[PDB]
Amino acid sequence: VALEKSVSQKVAAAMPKLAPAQYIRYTPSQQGVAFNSGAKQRVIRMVEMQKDPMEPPRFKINKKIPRGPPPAPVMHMTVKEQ
Amino acid sequence: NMLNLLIHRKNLNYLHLDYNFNLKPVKTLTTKERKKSRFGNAFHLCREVLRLTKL
Amino acid sequence: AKTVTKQRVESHFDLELRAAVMHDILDMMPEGIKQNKARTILQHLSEAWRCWKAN
Amino acid sequence: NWIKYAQWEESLKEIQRARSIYERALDVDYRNITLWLKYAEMEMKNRQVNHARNIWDRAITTLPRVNQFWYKYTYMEEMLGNVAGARQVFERWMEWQPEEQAWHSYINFELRYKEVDRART
Amino acid sequence: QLSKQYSSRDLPSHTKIKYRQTTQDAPEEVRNRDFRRELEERERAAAREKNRDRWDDDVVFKNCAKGVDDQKKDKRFVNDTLRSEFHKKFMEKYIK
RNA sequence: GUGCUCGCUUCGGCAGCACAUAUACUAAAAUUGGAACGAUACAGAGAAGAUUAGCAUGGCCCCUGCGCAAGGAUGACACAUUCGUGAAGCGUU
Ligand SMILES: [Mg+2]
Ligand SMILES: [Mg+2]
Ligand SMILES: [Mg+2]
Ligand SMILES: [Mg+2]
């Protein structure tokens, strides 16, 4: 199931519509009773922005930056042989 | 309009597209200009299909 | 990604022959511990191949 | 090339740069024992005891079989005066069941102090 | 950061997976089979098949072509590129 | 804003009720710093003595190209004599 989800996202490219209104409840970390009107929480309605279907790829991805770098321990000569 | 925007988008100011979709050049081209200005078949195919509809 | 092709085949075959010998033998021959004659063993390879071409 | 670069920055006393160079070199080839010795040495030369201590620990952890690391590690601790530390290191080392000579060095270590009971053990 | 670029090759093809069928040789059959018996009997059959299958008063020279029965040079396979019989034939044919 | 309250009740005003419920990269601007393969100028193609054909390999280099094709200078980039210190470890006289 997990793989299939992943695949569908990849396949989204090959096959060029979202309608959810989703609400969230937020606790801040600042508080103080003068920060909001005076609520321990706020509520935000998240809406996905509509994309223009004839809009080209906005920005440029080509840029290239060198591969990032701990080794496991290895745990594994005569003069004549040399 | 599409095709002119493409042309300008790439700063090909020495090309000229007329209204029956003939892509011409303004001046004799320099070597470098000739390289840069080529369009591939995609653009030309589109151009010619548009020409047909304009007829 | 590049695809093997007629232009590239002879180069390809010798590329992966140099690699075949290199991986095999330097993973096979060793205990030089420093660098064991990789440049040199391959030069022996090309030398031998020329010699067989000249009989 | 890695080493020469590190050395040059070390000479200019830009040792934070030097550290990054050594770490980058390690990313390329962590098995190379000269590299590690140069790295630890650099820290010691600049009196950066705790950096050196870290580095030594890493070296013996990832390449336990290299006896050069162990000999230097114990020597450094002995010079610093930390007999207990050195003992601890040697006890780690002995877990690898190493080589006759290593055991001799551990015993001799003990015998630079009286510690005859330890030696016998 | 996934590019909107495409390629001809990439497009769908053979989206269905041909599962093996029962007479093609589904794994079910395979698990049940006694291969060793089958292999022996086939072998025996093959062997049996093989068995079934099988004047001039004046001249310089008396017959050269006496016992010269071709020889198995084309039955020998040789792992040597220049002494394979194939190579000989090739060399014979294309140089004058 | 439209309609309706045998609304007050004239046809003016006022009241009640129903219906109708949150647009927008707000600028018609202001500022802010990478690219033209322009001319000019200097200089001037890998491999061996030279002249040249090319496929490649590697990627903090790209460009043309629908392209897993092919091109871009092979795209560019790729530069025989003779020993001894110092420290540490181990065994020995
Ligand atoms: Mg070619
Ligand atoms: Mg040429
Ligand atoms: Mg090319
Ligand atoms: Mg090239």
The full DSSP string for A37-72 is SS-S-EEEEEEPPPP-TTPPP-S------PPP--PP
Angle between the D33-45 and D67-80 helix axes, to the nearest 10 degrees? 10
Neighbours of D39 (CB within 10 A): 25
CA of A20 to C1' of F19 (A): 30
**E50 to chain A nearest CA, in Å?**
53
Put residue A46 in one of left, alpha, beta given phi > 0 → left and psi -120 to 50 → alpha. beta
> E12: CA distance to ligand 2 center in Å?
41
Measured in residues, chain B has a length of 55
- The half-sphere exposure of D63 on its side-chain side, counting CA atoms within 13 A, is 18
How far apart are the C-alpha atoms of D58 and D52, rounded to whole Å? 10
Contact A81 C31 (CB under 8 A): yes
Q: Are A78 and D69 in contact (CB under 8 A)?
A: no
Chain F positions with an atom below 7 A of a protein C-beta are 25, 36-39, 54-57, 59-72, 88-91
Residue B28 DSSP code? P
State residue D60 phi and psi, 5-degree precision.
-75, -25
SS3 A24: strand
Quoted resolution (Å) = 4.9
Distances (CA, A) of A12 to A6, A8, A48, D32: 10, 6, 18, 46
Sequence-distant (6+) residues with CB within 8 A of A28 are: A35, A36, A41, A42
Q: Which method, experimentally, gave rise to this model?
A: cryo-EM
Q: Which residues, including other chains, have CB under 8 Å from residue A77's CB and lie 6 or more apart?
A: C31, C33
Question: Rg of chain B over CA atoms, in angstroms?
Answer: 11
**Could you give the CA distance from residue D76 to residue D70 in angstroms, rounded to a whole number?**
10
Q: Determine how β-strand A42-47 pairs with β-strand A21-26.
A: antiparallel
Nearest to B12 by CA among D107, B29, A70: B29
- Nearest ligand, measured from the Cα of C6: 1
Residues in chain A closer than 8 A to C34 (CB atoms) = none
D56 contacts D79 by C-beta, under 8 angstroms: no
Cα dihedral: E62, E64, E66, E70 (round 10): -170
Angle of CA points D87, D96, D25, to nearest 5°: 90
Q: How many residues does chain A have?
A: 82
What Rg do the C-alpha atoms of chain A give, in angstroms? 27
Q: How far apart are CA D98 and CA D75, in angstroms?
A: 18
- CA–CA gap between residue A71 and residue D65 (Å, rounded): 14
Q: Write the single-letter amino acid at E81.
A: T
C-alpha to C-alpha distance for E30 and E35, rounded to whole angstroms:
8
- Set of chain A residues whose Cβ sits within 8 Å of the Cβ of D36: none
Give the C-alpha separation, B15 to B12, whole Å.
Answer: 6
Determine the Cα–Cα distance for residues C41 and C21; give it in Å rounded to an integer. Answer: 9
C-beta pairs of D23-28 under 8 Å, 24+ apart in sequence: D23/A69, D24/A69, D26/A69, D27/A69, D28/D2
Among candidate residues B50, B41, B1, the one with its CA nearest the CA of residue B22: B50
Spatial CA neighbour of B17 closest among B46, B47, B40, B45: B47
Contacts of residue B50, defined as CB under 8 A and 6 or more positions apart, other chains included, come to B3, B21
**A75 Cβ within 7 A of any nucleic strand F atom:** no
For residues E43-77, one letter each, b for 16 or more C-beta atoms within 10 angstroms of the residue's C-beta and e for the rest, the string is eeeeeeeeeeeeeeeeeeeeeeeeeeeeeeeeeee
- Using the CB atoms, write b or e for B12-28: b if 16+ within 10 Å: bebbeeeeebebeeeee
Q: How far is the CA of D11 from the C1' of F82 (A)?
A: 33
